[PDB]
Ligand binder design. Structure first.
Ligand SMILES: [Cl-]
Ligand SMILES: [Cl-]
Ligand SMILES: [Zn+2]
Length: 311
């Protein structure tokens, strides 16, 4: 079956703290192979050998040299090309790209896993024609990737798309009222979007205004059932998210927004944003298309592979 070749083949590696996932994709961006191997715990020479080994395995299997893209929970330092990460400790501070290239014998592209998610959504059949795609993960945190013409915009410091680490716009702060909580952020700042618009934030906001720790799922369940406190919280949160989106869209004006992560599963978001965002936009501007992510489960490997699509 593998001899039914396209001219080019794209390999994607999603490197996680416990497993490395590989995927091969043809020119139509169809997936033609899948494999997972353990991430070598604290053995960098073995990490390099494992990745190089997969490239060699599939190159022989397809009788061709696939393009190599890799995503990880981290990023490259823009000035010295070493990896910044905590979940793949063996790679921390290492010139991962240069080491792989020397071992494998050809170019490798590396990118943050959330940027890979965004790129994966942007290459879905329905979004391929969108000039810009903003892919955001609302779960553990908030933020993502800015895709232009099917290519990730990394930024001068490889941090473009870190919308989670801008402070709340003033209108969002006023919306929270007299009892608004100033939430700390793990980046070192106070009041970051990451601490309010994430799944974790949704829960902290409920706990702060009602002195009770409920899990997102249960709060959504209570709202659906008709609990008054849950409804008040959902109303508060929906307008907050709309305000923050309005500010973001005024500066970045994306064509389509794709939402991933645990909270992206809360369907009311898709009904509510189109009704609330326009208020916070310039009079001449319309709310972009905001949709639930379609390829979240394999977004890391897909996006990593797609880093090499010739633009
Ligand atoms: Cl796929
Ligand atoms: Cl999540
Ligand atoms: Zn922050």
């Amino acid at each position: 079956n593998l001899y039914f070749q396209s001219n080019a083949m794209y390999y994607g590696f999603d490197v996680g703290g416990t497993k490395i996932e590989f995927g091969a994709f043809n020119e139509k961006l169809e997936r033609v192979a899948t494999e997972r191997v353990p991430t070598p715990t604290d053995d960098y020479p073995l990490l390099l050998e494992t990745i190089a080994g997969l490239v060699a395995k599939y190159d022989q299997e397809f009788a061709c040299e696939g393009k190599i893209g890799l995503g990880l929970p981290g990023m490259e330092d823009a000035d010295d090309a070493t990896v910044l990460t905590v979940n793949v400790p063996a790679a921390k501070g290492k010139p991962l790209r240069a080491d792989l290239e020397a071992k494998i014998g050809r170019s490798v592209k590396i990118e943050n896993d959330a940027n890979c998610f965004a790129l994966s959504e942007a290459w879905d059949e329905e979004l391929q024609d969108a000039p810009s795609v903003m892919g955001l993960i609302l779960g553990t945190g908030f933020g993502g990737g800015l895709i232009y013409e099917g290519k990730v915009f990394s930024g001068r410091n490889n941090v473009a798309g870190e919308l989670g680490h801008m402070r709340l716009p003033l209108d969002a702060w006023f919306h929270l009222g007299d009892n608004a909580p100033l939430l700390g952020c793990g980046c070192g700042k106070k009041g970051c979007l990451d601490s309010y618009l994430s799944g974790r934030g949704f829960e902290l906001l409920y706990a702060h205004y009602y002195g009770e720790e409920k899990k997102a799922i249960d709060i959504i369940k209570a709202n659906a059932a008709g609990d008054e406190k849950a409804a008040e919280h959902v109303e508060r949160f929906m307008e907050l998210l709309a305000i923050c989106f309005g500010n973001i869209f005024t500066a970045n004006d994306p064509h389509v927004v794709a939402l991933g992560g645990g909270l992206s599963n809360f369907e009311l978001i898709y009904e509510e944003m189109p009704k609330r965002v326009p208020k916070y936009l310039l009079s001449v501007a319309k709310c972009p298309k905001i949709i639930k992510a379609k390829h979240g489960d394999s977004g890391g490997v897909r996006g990593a592979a797609f880093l090499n699509i010739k633009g």
